[PDB]
Design a binder for this molecule. Structure first.
Ligand SMILES: COc1ccc(-n2nc3c(c2NC(=O)c2ccc(C(=O)c4ccccc4)cc2)CS(=O)(=O)C3)cc1
Length: 491
């Protein structure tokens, strides 16, 4: 008969999955696969929190596929190596994927499409990771992605309204389509543990961001309910991970960005009684869309050299200073607490991202945004290659049409956000004995207060790695020199 395979990569969900929906129709068998390769050289920068989140996403998909008398098939290796084997072993004639706009993904999928055509396999590709067809955005702009956010808002406003999200895969949708299964299915296709991937899980606590579609849909309800109770304002509690947080689920595809969009539009129309909401309503959704669009045709989006849209800034190379930043031992408790939360949990507030990005690049250390991006790629759960690269370029003053002239204070920003320093004490236990007057600048604490706090600066917690007033004055001057001769730094 017609034997079909749906290939999960992103879109780790059964709701709003047009590719899986189309693949099942007219099919006699269906197998959903995820191709996992934790040893891939190109994935050497993936942190353990990302691996854990993904594995929890796969367990949730497997559990939800159980409800449809199916299972997830987890397969080890590289798609180019695995798919020809599967095409023959399973006699596959249909393969479905959610479209991937990112350059590496487009390249991989082009190769797989060639293997499928060679094997007599029809390839079904449907767009569902983004709100729009990004290629249509670019065509509407004249063939180039809009290089500014409000130009992007202009084009998007002129587009056709979004079509309804695809129906969720139910028993009545599967119909006669079945999944051939064996009693030993877990031995060959089961979802592995972190330990089974060779990871020592020593030092791991319960995940602050549990993966999966079930979690995402539960959080979506809470998120809308809280919104039922304009751009929000950050306070101290905003720094903590929220049970209403959706951002990692949108990144992995646990939550459909189109479903989220429609639920937001639905809620707005109920409270504000009109169908033309402020683009404010969608929060980061269009920033998300903006960076996917800017990156899709730029294979060097994550680089400075050879990247046509990036300002060629002469950053310093300082591996020791970069390591202090990445490992949260800069000696600035505000910076270190943020980098510690990021490493421990996999999410930090957007304004905390601005703070540590400024400190590393244009503000204090004058280290390339490429190096910050690599660290964030390792640890951050909610930012794809396209969004990470674009965000680091924009925030480091590396885009020609976005400048920041105010340098974040690595003491005052934290003190102004959380005056008592509860955030510091939560993530930097060595500093817990310091009173609020010194918690953001413990080097200013007299020797007696340090001894009482059982924390000698330079012994138990490092001294501040730079003099911020001097470093920022020099770096503000350097950035002013660059933008005074901006065209000279065009590649
Ligand atoms: C520093 O490292 C990172 C920082 C942020 C992220 N990040 N993660 C996600 C998203 C983003 N990024 C942005 O939303 C974004 C928005 C505005 C700008 C900006 O230039 C600007 C202009 C005017 C005023 C204020 C700001 C830059 C970035 C959206 S998402 O895909 O949903 C999940 C990743 C790494």
């Amino acid at each position: 008969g017609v034997n079909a395979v749906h290939w999960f990569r992103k879109g780790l969900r059964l709701h709003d999955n047009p590719a899986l929906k189309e693949c099942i129709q007219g099919a006699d068998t269906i197998r959903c696969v995820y191709i996992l390769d934790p040893w891939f050289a190109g994935s050497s920068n993936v942190g353990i929190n990302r691996w854990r989140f993904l594995l929890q996403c796969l367990e949730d998909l497997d559990a939800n596929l159980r409800k449809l008398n199916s299972r997830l098939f987890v397969i080890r290796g590289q798609p180019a190596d695995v798919f020809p084997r599967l095409f023959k072993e399973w006699n596959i004639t249909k393969l479905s994927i959610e479209y991937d706009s990112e350059p590496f993904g487009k390249e991989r999928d082009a190769a797989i499409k060639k293997l499928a055509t060679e094997a007599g396999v029809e390839v079904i590709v449907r767009i569902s990771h983004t709100l729009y067809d990004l290629d249509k955005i670019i065509e509407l702009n004249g063939g180039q992605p809009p290089l500014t956010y409000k130009r992007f808002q202009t084009l998007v406003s002129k587009m056709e309204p979004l079509e309804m999200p695809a129906d969720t895969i139910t028993s009545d949708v599967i119909g006669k389509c079945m999944t051939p299964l064996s009693d030993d299915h877990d031995e060959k296709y089961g979802v592995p543990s972190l330990e089974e991937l060779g990871f020592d899980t020593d030092g791991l606590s319960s995940a602050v961001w549990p993966g999966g579609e079930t979690e995402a849909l539960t959080r979506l309800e809470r998120h809308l309910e809280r919104k039922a109770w304009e751009r929000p304002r950050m306070n101290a509690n905003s720094l903590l991970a929220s049970p209403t947080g959706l951002s990692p689920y949108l990144r992995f595809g646990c939550l459909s960005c189109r479903l989220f969009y429609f639920k937001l539009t639905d809620l707005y129309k109920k409270v504000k009684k009109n169908s033309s909401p402020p683009l404010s309503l969608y929060g980061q959704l269009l920033w998300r869309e903006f960076f996917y669009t800017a990156a899709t045709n730029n294979p060097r989006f994550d680089k400075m050299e050879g990247n046509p849209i990036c300002v060629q800034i002469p950053w310093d190379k300082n591996p020791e200073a970069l390591a202090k930043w990445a490992e949260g031992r800069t000696g600035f408790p505000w910076i270190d607490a943020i980098m510690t939360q990021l490493r421990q949990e996999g999410w930090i507030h957007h304004l905390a991202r601005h703070a540590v990005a400024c400190f590393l690049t244009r503000g204090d250390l004058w280290i390339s945004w490429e190096e910050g991006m690599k660290v964030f790629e390792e640890l951050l759960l909610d930012a794809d290659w396209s969004i990470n690269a674009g965000s680091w370029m924009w925030l480091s003053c590396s885009s020609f049409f976005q400048q920041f002239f105010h340098c974040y204070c690595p003491v005052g920003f934290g003190r102004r956000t959380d005056p008592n320093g509860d955030y510091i004490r939560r993530y930097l236990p060595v500093l817990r004995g310091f009173p609020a007057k010194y918690i953001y600048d413990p080097w200013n604490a007299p020797e007696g207060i340090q001894k009482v706090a059982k924390c000698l600066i330079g012994v138990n917690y490092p001294k501040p790695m730079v003099n911020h007033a001097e470093a920022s004055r020099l770096n503000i001057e350097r950035m002013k020199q660059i933008y005074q001769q901006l065209s000279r730094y065009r590649g």
